[PDB]
Design a protein around this motif. Structure first.
Motif, short mmCIF file in Angstrom:
data_model
loop_
_atom_site.label_atom_id
_atom_site.label_comp_id
_atom_site.label_asym_id
_atom_site.label_seq_id
_atom_site.Cartn_x
_atom_site.Cartn_y
_atom_site.Cartn_z
N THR A 1 0.83 -1.20 0.00
CA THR A 1 0.00 0.00 0.00
C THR A 1 0.87 1.26 0.00
OG1 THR A 1 -2.01 -0.90 1.01
CG2 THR A 1 -1.53 1.40 1.47
N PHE A 2 1.92 1.25 0.81
CA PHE A 2 2.81 2.40 0.91
C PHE A 2 3.77 2.52 -0.26
CE2 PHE A 2 1.41 1.82 5.34
CZ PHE A 2 0.79 3.06 5.47
N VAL A 3 4.09 1.39 -0.88
CA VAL A 3 4.97 1.44 -2.03
C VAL A 3 4.16 2.05 -3.17
CG1 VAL A 3 5.87 0.03 -3.91
CG2 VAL A 3 6.59 -0.39 -1.54
N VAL A 4 2.89 1.66 -3.25
CA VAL A 4 1.99 2.17 -4.29
C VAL A 4 1.75 3.66 -4.09
CG1 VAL A 4 -0.43 2.16 -5.05
CG2 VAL A 4 0.85 0.03 -4.90
N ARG A 5 1.67 4.08 -2.82
CA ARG A 5 1.47 5.49 -2.51
C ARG A 5 2.62 6.30 -3.12
NH1 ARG A 5 -0.93 9.04 2.14
NH2 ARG A 5 0.13 10.99 1.56
N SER A 6 3.85 5.82 -2.93
CA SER A 6 5.02 6.50 -3.48
C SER A 6 4.97 6.51 -5.00
CB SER A 6 6.31 5.80 -3.02
OG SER A 6 6.59 6.10 -1.66
N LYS A 7 4.51 5.41 -5.59
CA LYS A 7 4.40 5.31 -7.05
C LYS A 7 3.38 6.30 -7.59
CE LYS A 7 5.57 0.43 -7.63
NZ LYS A 7 5.45 -0.73 -8.57
N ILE A 8 2.28 6.47 -6.86
CA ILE A 8 1.22 7.38 -7.27
C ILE A 8 1.70 8.83 -7.26
CG2 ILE A 8 -0.87 8.43 -6.35
CD1 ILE A 8 -1.72 5.35 -5.81
N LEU A 9 2.36 9.24 -6.18
CA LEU A 9 2.87 10.61 -6.09
C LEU A 9 3.87 10.90 -7.21
CD1 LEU A 9 2.79 10.62 -2.37
CD2 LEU A 9 2.31 12.73 -3.59
N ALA A 10 4.75 9.94 -7.47
CA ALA A 10 5.75 10.09 -8.53
C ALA A 10 5.04 10.22 -9.87
CB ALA A 10 6.68 8.88 -8.56
N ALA A 11 3.98 9.44 -10.05
CA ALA A 11 3.20 9.44 -11.28
C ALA A 11 2.42 10.74 -11.45
CB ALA A 11 2.24 8.25 -11.28
N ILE A 12 1.99 11.33 -10.34
CA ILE A 12 1.25 12.58 -10.41
C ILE A 12 2.19 13.69 -10.87
CG2 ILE A 12 0.13 14.40 -9.12
CD1 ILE A 12 -0.95 12.21 -7.23
N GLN B 1 4.90 13.39 -12.62
CA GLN B 1 5.23 13.17 -14.02
C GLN B 1 4.09 13.66 -14.90
OE1 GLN B 1 5.36 9.02 -15.25
NE2 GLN B 1 6.95 9.47 -16.77
N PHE B 2 2.86 13.38 -14.48
CA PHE B 2 1.67 13.79 -15.21
C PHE B 2 1.58 15.32 -15.29
CE2 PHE B 2 -2.78 13.35 -16.58
CZ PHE B 2 -3.35 14.55 -16.15
N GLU C 1 -11.62 17.82 -17.17
CA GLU C 1 -10.91 16.97 -18.12
C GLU C 1 -9.58 16.51 -17.53
N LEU C 2 -8.89 17.42 -16.86
CA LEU C 2 -7.61 17.09 -16.25
C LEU C 2 -7.80 16.03 -15.18
CD1 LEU C 2 -4.78 19.53 -15.27
CD2 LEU C 2 -5.60 17.83 -13.63
N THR C 3 -8.83 16.20 -14.36
CA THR C 3 -9.13 15.23 -13.31
C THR C 3 -9.37 13.83 -13.89
OG1 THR C 3 -10.08 16.89 -11.83
CG2 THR C 3 -10.70 14.62 -11.44
N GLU C 4 -10.26 13.74 -14.88
CA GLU C 4 -10.56 12.46 -15.52
C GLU C 4 -9.32 11.82 -16.15
OE1 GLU C 4 -13.89 13.20 -18.17
OE2 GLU C 4 -15.33 12.93 -16.53
N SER C 5 -8.45 12.63 -16.75
CA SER C 5 -7.23 12.09 -17.36
C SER C 5 -6.25 11.63 -16.29
CB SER C 5 -6.54 13.13 -18.23
OG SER C 5 -7.37 13.53 -19.31
N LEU C 6 -6.17 12.38 -15.19
CA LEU C 6 -5.25 12.01 -14.13
C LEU C 6 -5.61 10.65 -13.53
CD1 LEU C 6 -2.92 12.75 -12.19
CD2 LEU C 6 -4.67 13.67 -10.68
N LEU D 1 -3.33 7.38 -13.87
CA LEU D 1 -2.82 6.74 -12.66
C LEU D 1 -3.26 5.28 -12.57
CD1 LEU D 1 -3.42 9.46 -9.92
CD2 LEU D 1 -1.22 8.78 -10.87
N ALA D 2 -4.53 5.02 -12.82
CA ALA D 2 -5.04 3.65 -12.75
C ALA D 2 -4.30 2.78 -13.77
CB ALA D 2 -6.54 3.63 -13.04
N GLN D 3 -4.20 3.25 -15.00
CA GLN D 3 -3.52 2.51 -16.05
C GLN D 3 -2.04 2.30 -15.73
OE1 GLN D 3 -5.04 1.17 -19.11
NE2 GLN D 3 -3.12 0.05 -18.73
N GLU D 4 -1.33 3.39 -15.49
CA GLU D 4 0.10 3.34 -15.20
C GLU D 4 0.48 2.60 -13.93
OE1 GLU D 4 -0.10 5.26 -17.92
OE2 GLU D 4 1.34 6.92 -17.79
N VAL D 5 -0.26 2.83 -12.85
CA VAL D 5 0.05 2.20 -11.58
C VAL D 5 -0.58 0.83 -11.33
CG1 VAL D 5 0.05 2.53 -9.07
CG2 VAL D 5 0.40 4.49 -10.57
#
Ligand SMILES: Nc1ncnc2c1ncn2[C@@H]1O[C@H](COP(=O)(O)OP(=O)(O)OP(=O)(O)O)[C@@H](O)[C@H]1O
Ligand SMILES: Nc1ncnc2c1ncn2[C@@H]1O[C@H](COP(=O)(O)OP(=O)(O)OP(=O)(O)O)[C@@H](O)[C@H]1O
Ligand SMILES: N[C@@H](CCCC[NH3+])C(=O)O
Ligand SMILES: N[C@@H](CCCC[NH3+])C(=O)O
Ligand SMILES: [Mn+2]
Ligand SMILES: [Mn+2]
Ligand SMILES: [Mn+2]
Ligand SMILES: [Mn+2]
Ligand SMILES: [Mn+2]
Ligand SMILES: [Mn+2]
Lengths: 485, 485
Positions: free
Chosen positions: A165-176, A178-179, A274-279, A283-287
């Motif tokens: 859960t916490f590793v994914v949290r870090s992945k999500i922030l990094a992905a945000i 980048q986005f 639109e930005l929210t929906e794309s984010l 995130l779901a796709q990438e993570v």
């Protein structure tokens, strides 16, 4: 019962013995691989290949399991990447190490090993040790359900699901990041200590700066500073950091939480939608590898548009017997609001009452990703007024899983209007509203220099992390959640 | 004098007129290019190419300059990327726009334009406008030297050098994350509100949580939480965030500042020294394009090793007449310390006095990148004790430009020792040291479960940003520095 106290005594006695031999706590062993790396690269090779490859590696971690079978033992070593098997044999290690050291260690002890890779009979990747050392003696044996939060280190050692859960949290922030950076946004750092708190409606935490004998507040939101930067020319800025609100702990509230605020000039709330929906789709796709996310008993398809309703439509939809005309009359709305359990404060106006009704009536039912538009002006002092109906603003909030995840709107860049709305907030505070905003003269001045038309969005990062890790309490996505003494 | 007040009146009257026409503050115009993009892609093309290319673009920004030459005008538009020239002609824009609108606008007004790219006689990239609008009316004309910090938006609008400093700051942080992530470090978020502050020696800011009627402190450092995570298994973690210290403002001190703390298991301070040198070399190369950095009247070669001295060597080198034997006797050291102006507190021991002497004597002279090793145990309650001399710890600090930039050491993973050092700190606080650490029983407990040998490093990000932007006050690298009321 007392078997735990003998574990503690045994460990202290073993340590005492280490102290007599010299330096009990060394810092010398160096590894060159983590378990995840070894598995990724060699899981696919059979014993024949590994044998001819004759690869020697060094690992270190916690001894999770040990099975002593005479002159040979099998150990499970757990490191940052996961677990790897160790094959420990008396005649493979230097003289005396196996019997005088290895056998005296305890589960939980931090150890280091160097050996050759191979595959066990079961087909598992394992390391035939040629060197093995005790790095840190564990004085305590390996680990309500509140302990998980009171001693998060034990939870991380014990539960891999929690680690993930916490590793994914870090992945999500990094992905945000980048986005956002991919869209030309620049990350900034604004004050967390403010003389005048603002940007939201909340009870702040207050403190004192001795040097200046000045009372100050922990920020409840960076909004007013971020818009100052847009006036300055940083037309695409974002900040992902802590906010502090002096309110009670809950399944979706922590006194300090992480939020992302972003502002983009020459855009309106539609652009934020639109930005929210794309984010979320990104995130779901990438993570997670898919746009369909399972949360509790539901599935969120971040591959399709969020649902969209006005605040009144949501109210009408979740309390069908509501006479919508009631929301147009202060007395009727106040009566309606009270009939459903809302305590209407003296400072509240119609817009505030309708918003409160929405909260009580619809919020919990917005399970699938939903956008709620047309927020009353009274509860949106910093939002752009709607062109056709001045009583509402070009603002929205979105909900997923019955919880509010974000808040955004076309920004108010009309200085005179802003000053007036600040005055209304001051009156409200004087009338009892302890969450009403403070008048910020310098902010008004900044708007007088000219703020480009802008769209800003705030997203609760912890609430967002919950949806991507199937967590049902915010306490499961914050490493060290606030806890009752 | 009064010409400024007529500027204000004129702008308010112009706005009043906009209000009578309808919605004064629209949010509709959309651009598709920023100045930097246009220059990067088309600066290299001559009027012949651009003419045949016939590229139409849309931009928006602040009107910085306007030169009305009859039926044609020249404008400098400034956006997030910089500046671009606009060619405004009566007959190129829709009827009446030029004379009834454009000419009535003011410098500072936020405008939007759409037109075709071309190169002026001077060879500048310019946009021959076919559409032009007023997006936001500026009620105030374009902008001690403290104003720069009191109204940072004006500084950003006016000084490109200031903008560049903050853009570089963002680039540096992004580069640090990339550097750390490339080494397997995972970014985490630990509490900023703590019941027991620790991780450093400083006066904390205190606040109150009404819900739990609990007094709490803003964190002075995340160290104790980050090491808890290493015990949990996150063997390579880092956090880049705010720290708060209840101390006065200075040229290198802000009550809230940004720091990066990193911890890597199975490593010692020597590994941190290498990491530090690589980080600076990488950042200088990647961000500034060269490893030789000009700061004030000096040049730092981040391409060569930092200098390295023990604390005593630094003292001996900068106060050559010092009888080094004085640092071995409490009375002699106390006398020495006082002779140079240090007020020796009753709680201080020899190690603290020697450290204070070092601060007074050498710190300011460490101009070129320098590592200072062998910090006394008394002033390093969380650092690993040196194997040969227990009175010092395996810790260092590094300085650049006469200022402390970082602090790192092999971590103390000896629970019993840690508990004792915490007790000494408690005694110290009882003896008058208002910066001494609080006893943290849960932290000791975490160490009892076993912390792998580890090396941790803390770097002041603001201080680091100063060196890469030739800034000589921390107030020049923090968007909204703390200021005296
Ligand atoms: N105490 C909290 N803990 C975690 N996240 C929070 C908390 N308070 C607010 N947030 C998040 O920050 C976002 C922006 O702040 P905002 O003022 O809109 O919250 P809010 O509407 O007061 O929250 P809620 O309605 O959930 O109480 C919210 O949409 C939510 O996602
Ligand atoms: N008030 C401050 N403002 C900015 N950076 C700071 C401040 N205090 C400390 N730092 C930075 O944080 C790092 C880690 O904290 P530390 O406790 O070592 O600082 P310090 O030694 O008290 O600082 P100094 O000696 O400069 O007063 C320091 O090396 C420094 O770079
Ligand atoms: N400041 C808002 C989020 C941003 C709103 C858009 N300006 C909040 O705290 O909820
Ligand atoms: N916590 C230290 C930095 C990290 C030291 C290494 N454990 C400080 O605040 O200075
Ligand atoms: Mn709330
Ligand atoms: Mn809400
Ligand atoms: Mn809200
Ligand atoms: Mn200091
Ligand atoms: Mn110092
Ligand atoms: Mn220091």
């Amino acid at each position: 019962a007392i078997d735990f106290n003998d574990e503690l005594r045994n460990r202290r006695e073993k340590l005492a013995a280490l102290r007599q031999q010299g330096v009990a706590f060394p810092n010398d062993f160096r590894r060159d691989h983590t378990s995840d790396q070894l598995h990724e690269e060699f899981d696919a090779k059979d014993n024949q290949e590994l044998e001819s490859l004759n690869i020697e590696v060094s690992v270190a971690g916690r001894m999770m399991t040990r099975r002593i079978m005479g002159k040979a033992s099998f150990v499970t070593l757990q490191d940052v990447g996961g677990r790897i098997q160790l094959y420990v044999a008396r005649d493979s290690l230097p003289e005396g190490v196996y019997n005088d050291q290895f056998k005296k260690w305890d589960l939980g002890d931090i150890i280091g090993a160097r050996g050759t890779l191979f595959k066990t009979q079961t087909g598992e990747l394992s390391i035939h040790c040629t060197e093995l050392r005790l790095l840190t003696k564990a004085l305590r044996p390996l680990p309500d359900q509140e302990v998980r939060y009171r001693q998060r280190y034990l939870d991380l050692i014990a539960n891999d699901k929690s680690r993930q859960t916490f590793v994914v949290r870090s992945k999500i922030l990094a992905a945000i990041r980048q986005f956002m950076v991919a869209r030309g946004f620049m990350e900034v750092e604004t004050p967390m200590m403010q003389v005048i708190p603002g940007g939201a409606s909340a009870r702040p935490f207050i403190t004192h700066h001795n040097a200046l004998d000045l009372d100050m507040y922990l920020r409840i939101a960076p909004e007013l500073y971020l818009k100052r930067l847009v006036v300055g020319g940083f037309e695409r800025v974002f900040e992902i950091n802590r906010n502090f609100r002096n309110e009670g702990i809950s399944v979706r509230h922590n006194p300090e939480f992480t939020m992302m605020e972003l502002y983009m000039a020459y855009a309106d709330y539609h652009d934020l939608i639109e930005l929210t929906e794309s984010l979320f789709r990104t995130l779901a796709q990438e993570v997670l590898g898919t746009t369909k996310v399972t949360y509790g008993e539901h599935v969120f398809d971040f591959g399709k548009p969020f649902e969209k309703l006005t605040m009144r439509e949501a109210i009408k939809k979740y309390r069908p017997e509501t006479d919508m005309a009631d929301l147009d009359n202060f007395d009727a709305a106040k009566a309606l609001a009270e009939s459903i359990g809302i305590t209407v404060e003296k400072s509240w106006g119609l817009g505030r009452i309708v918003t409160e009704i929405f909260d009580e009536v619809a919020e919990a039912h917005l399970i699938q990703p939903t956008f709620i538009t047309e927020y009353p002006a009274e509860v949106s002092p910093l939002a752009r007024r709607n062109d056709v109906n001045p009583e509402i603003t070009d603002r929205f909030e979105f909900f997923i899983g019955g919880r509010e995840i974000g808040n955004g709107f076309s920004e108010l860049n009309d200085a005179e209007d802003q000053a007036e709305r600040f005055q209304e907030q001051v009156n409200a505070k004087a009338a009892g509203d302890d969450e009403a905003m403070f008048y910020d003269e310098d902010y008004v001045t900044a708007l007088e220099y000219g703020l480009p038309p802008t769209a800003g969005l705030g997203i609760g990062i912890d609430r967002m992390i919950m949806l991507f890790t199937n967590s049902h309490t915010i306490r499961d996505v914050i490493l060290f959640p606030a806890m009752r003494p």
